[PDB]
Design a protein around this ligand. Structure first.
Ligand SMILES: Nc1nc2c(ncn2[C@@H]2O[C@H](COP(=O)(O)OP(=O)(O)CP(=O)(O)O)[C@@H](O)[C@H]2O)c(=O)[nH]1
Lengths: 126, 37, 99, 23, 136, 132, 313
RNA sequence: GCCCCUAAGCGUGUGCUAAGUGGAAAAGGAUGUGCAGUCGCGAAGACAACCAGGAGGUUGGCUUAGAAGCAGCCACCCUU
């Protein structure tokens, strides 16, 4: 939290990506820039790959927009913000993520109402 | 060892320390090793 | 154009002179004399730290509202006697600025 | 040098008050 | 060097090294200055050394002012001569410097370089001296 | 392993490959055969290929964007005529000219958009002092 | 300090025999002129005392300066040890006062040594990098300027120059054709050089005669008066010309210590050819990626690494 | 002056000194003390953070056979 800058980033992560249907979060460690570029190209249909300080994104989103999720902001996790898909493009974040060990998925915050363990073990199958 | 009344860093690597009640300059370059006396 | 006058409490001087001025400076108060068209030189002590802060933040030509035992008087720092070694304000000549 | 220095500096004592004969 | 074109009296009493400087105590020409903090007879050789140090540190640009002028002749009698038989001939040219006197002034765009050059000069000088600035 | 940019035309890639393959252990005749079989019709200007040394030998290739910034000098016929780039700017090929060749060479260019690739290519080329 | 001490010792050696009449006269003299309050330092200088004009003081100062000059000789020995041990070709610019020399150094290299039209502008020899055309590095050193009859008191002042001459490898002899009969200058410098050679019992090293100021010369001599010398080089440092010829003559005259080789360094070595390029003079290197044939003039230590890929031809 | 020599205080309160400084003297120099100011505070370190990426165009152009981010000169852009 750096005041002016944090406020601008709060605006960016509040009024530019929270307006989505599904909010996924991937814990990323050992991921190379090329690896994430390839994965993003694979999932170019959905998500936007936005990541910032967990405390910052918590204090921004969980208090201005989305509600009901806090534990997802205690580790190195990058948010997805599915553009228009619901679970159809979730394959690119499920199989192409679990084949690389790293990029561990979490979330499944469908229709921005309630949180779950991940919901991708069940709903991302389709 | 450069033993002079005045010891100062000669490069950005040199560090001024005070060891045994004595100002010295320690550096990765032994040429810049100094001591106050 | 103009700016808010800087507030400074300037108590009048009970005792004046060399010893009085030195003691005031030791206490940390720059002695001053406020004169001007009103034709009434007053002998004041401005808090040295606050006066110097005002001077260095708004410059020598900074208008000052001196609270002199409740009364507020506008005045500009006409002259500053500053010691060349200690660099402290030895004395201030303030000129009343009627509005 | 040392002798004169000591004889002169011993005037810097509380009893002498900064003065001594022959400095 | 700095030597007077002429002096009305070439065998003068030693300048009295007392009191702080009453004039020339602020930077009136340049942006930075060297203010003396002790009394000393700063000689023309010391002035020359200090100004050359400043000029060689600032290299190309910048302007240097030498506020003090060594116009006071300190005399010296011939070597291995007894006391008496008149006063010695003029030997050194000194400026009576007192605490608070600004000896040199410098204008140079780079503050660090200006301060380093003034530090050179101070090291050449025989007194404690600080770097003062026009901005009060 | 090593990008090892060598002439796209199979003329004589001796300076780059020789010393490079020296410590790598790859034999010159086999590598020349592999490179000749790779650059069959890919006779452009220059290709960088990643050998990807395996446990003993790989002979792998990785072509990404042979022309890259190096295409502008050979397109304008200016060659090594940019001493102080951005100062002694040469090869006045406008942006309306360089955009077509940039799109032509656009295969990977680490870019997902035409505008992004164009900006990257403009920045790369201008490093040699170009008046696009 | 070295130059000042040498000059002070020279002045005291000159003053000691003649301290009575001329000594007292110049002791009295306070005008601040040649000799009289001239000093032994430089700007301003110690004119008030000059050469101390006093037997006891002069002798004491002479002994002190002799000890000091021994110390400075040791210091210069240490300083020149690096060059002496590198065995790098040393080229000494000797010659008469004026006549470029310092200008010739600043031209053949990028140096900025003091170049003034006055006489005895250079009092300390100064060494610098130089690259022969063939690439052979060398050390070009400007020296102090000689005169027709150098005072015998300046032995210590000129000891540095004489030591540079003794080491030497080419002795670039700089003269100017814009003087009255430059052959007299040539002869004076040649006699001092021959005296040094006799003193140090060494073979006379090459002497590359070079003439400058030719641009400012009168050109009265066609080819045998203005260029009466058969193989003297003409440069005129100021207007760039002839300096390439001077460099070529330098390189030709300076015998090489390297050995020409034909080594076919493989392409799996890399370092053994990069170092050949680095310390060495590559030329006619084959572009074949297979065993090359680099005809470089490698130095002695590298010349022993041939049996790796020397081949036979 | 007041620990013993040596008369009277190993006096009282608070703090500082580590140098036997006290109990002799420029420049250089603190991980000693309070005091003040200026940045970062985001928790009396921050995006100098124990673990991760640190990329890509590209080996940016002059340079030679080598200049690969780091013989030497030019500025030093964009993408993600
Ligand atoms: N016109 C012209 N002038 C020259 C030439 N070479 C040198 N000069 C001038 O002659 C002067 C000689 O000074 P310098 O070059 O130092 O000669 P020098 O031998 O070092 C003098 P010293 O030996 O006492 O140090 C210089 O000021 C220089 O400008 C030349 O080729 N042409």
């Amino acid at each position: 939290m750096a005041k002016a800058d944090k406020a601008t980033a709060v605006a960016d992560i509040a009024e530019q990506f929270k307006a989505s249907t599904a909010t996924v979060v991937t814990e990323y460690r050992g991921l190379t820039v090329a690896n994430l570029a390839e994965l993003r190209r694979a999932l170019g249909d959905s998500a936007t790959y936005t990541v910032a300080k967990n405390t910052l994104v918590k204090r921004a989103a969980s208090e201005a927009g989305i509600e009901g999720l806090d534990e997802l902001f205690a580790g190195p996790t990058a948010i997805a913000f599915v553009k228009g898909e619901a679970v159809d493009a979730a394959k690119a974040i499920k199989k192409f993520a679990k084949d690389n060990k790293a990029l561990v998925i979490k979330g499944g915050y469908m229709d921005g109402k309630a949180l779950s363990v991940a919901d991708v073990e069940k709903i991302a199958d389709l | 060892m450069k033993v002079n009344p005045s010891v100062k860093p000669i490069c950005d690597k040199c560090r001024v320390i005070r060891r045994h009640g004595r100002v010295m300059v320690i550096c990765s370059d032994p040429r810049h090793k100094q001591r106050q006396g | 154009t103009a700016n808010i006058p800087n507030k400074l409490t300037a108590n009048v001087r009970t005792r004046t002179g060399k010893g009085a001025s030195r003691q005031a400076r030791r206490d940390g108060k720059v002695p001053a004399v406020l004169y001007g068209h009103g034709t009434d030189p007053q002998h004041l002590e401005l808090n040295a730290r606050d006066f110097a802060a005002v001077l260095r933040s708004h410059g020598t030509n900074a208008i000052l509202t001196l609270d002199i035992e409740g009364t507020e008087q506008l005045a500009l720092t006409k002259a500053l006697d500053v010691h060349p070694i200690r660099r402290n304000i030895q004395h201030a000549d303030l000129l009343v600025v009627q509005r | 040098a040392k002798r004169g220095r000591k004889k002169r500096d011993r005037k810097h004592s509380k009893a002498n008050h900064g003065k001594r004969p022959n400095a | 060097m700095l030597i007077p074109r002429k002096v009305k009296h070439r065998k003068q009493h030693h300048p009295e090294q007392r009191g702080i400087a009453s004039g020339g105590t602020s930077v009136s020409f340049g942006d930075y200055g060297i203010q003396a903090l002790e009394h000393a007879y700063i000689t023309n050789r010391q002035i020359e050394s200090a100004r050359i140090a400043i000029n060689r540190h600032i290299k190309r640009g910048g302007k240097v002012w030498i506020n003090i002028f060594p116009d006071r002749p300190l005399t010296k009698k011939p070597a291995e001569t007894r006391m008496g038989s008149g006063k010695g001939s003029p030997e050194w040219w000194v400026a009576n410097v007192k605490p608070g006197r600004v000896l040199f002034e410098l204008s140079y765009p780079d503050e660090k370089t200006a301060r380093d050059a003034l530090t050179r000069a101070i090291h050449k000088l025989p007194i404690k001296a600080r770097i003062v600035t026009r901005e009060e | 392993l090593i990008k090892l940019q060598i002439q796209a035309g199979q003329a004589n890639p001796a300076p780059p490959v020789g010393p490079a393959l020296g410590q790598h252990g790859v034999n010159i005749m086999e590598f020349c055969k592999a490179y000749n079989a790779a650059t069959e019709s890919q006779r452009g200007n220059v290709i960088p290929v990643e050998i990807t040394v395996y446990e003993d030998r790989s002979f792998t290739f990785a072509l990404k964007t042979p022309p890259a910034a190096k295409l502008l000098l050979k397109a304008a016929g200016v060659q090594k005529g940019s001493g102080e780039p951005h100062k002694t700017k040469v090869a006045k090929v406008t942006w309306d000219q360089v955009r077509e060749i940039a799109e032509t060479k656009k295969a990977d260019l680490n870019a997902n958009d035409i505008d992004a690739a164009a900006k990257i290519i403009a920045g790369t080329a201008r490093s040699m002092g170009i008046t696009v | 300090r070295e130059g000042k001490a040498q000059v002070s010792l020279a002045q005291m050696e000159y003053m000691l025999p003649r301290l009575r009449g001329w000594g007292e006269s110049m002791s009295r003299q306070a005008g601040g002129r040649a000799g009289g309050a001239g000093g032994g330092v430089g700007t301003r200088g110690p004119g008030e005392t000059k050469i101390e004009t006093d037997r006891r003081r002069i002798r004491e100062r002479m002994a002190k300066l002799r000890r000091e000059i021994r110390d400075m000789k040791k210091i210069r020995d240490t300083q020149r040890g690096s060059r002496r041990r590198s065995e790098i070709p040393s080229v000494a610019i000797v010659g008469y006062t004026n006549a470029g020399k310092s200008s010739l150094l600043n031209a053949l290299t990028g140096a900025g040594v003091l170049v003034e039209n006055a006489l005895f502008a250079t009092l300390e020899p100064t060494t610098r990098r130089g690259e022969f055309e063939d690439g052979r590095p060398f050390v070009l050193t400007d020296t102090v300027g000689f005169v027709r009859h150098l005072p015998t008191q300046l032995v210590e002042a000129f000891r540095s120059t004489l030591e540079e001459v003794v080491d030497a490898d080419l002795l670039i002899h700089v003269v100017d054709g814009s003087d009255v009969n430059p052959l007299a200058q040539i002869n004076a410098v040649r006699t001092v050089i021959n005296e040094v050679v006799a003193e140090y019992d060494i073979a006379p090293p090459p002497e590359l005669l070079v003439v400058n100021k030719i641009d400012a010369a009168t050109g009265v001599g066609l080819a045998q008066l203005r260029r009466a010398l058969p193989d003297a080089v003409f440069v005129s440092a100021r207007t760039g010309d002839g300096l390439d010829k001077l460099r070529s003559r330098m390189g030709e005259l300076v015998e090489s210590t390297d050995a020409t080789v034909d080594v076919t360094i493989p392409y799996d070595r890399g370092d053994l050819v990069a170092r050949v390029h680095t310390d060495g003079h590559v030329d006619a290197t084959e572009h074949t990626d297979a065993g090359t044939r680099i005809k470089a003039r490698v130095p002695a230590p590298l010349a022993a690494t041939l049996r790796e890929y020397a081949t036979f031809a």
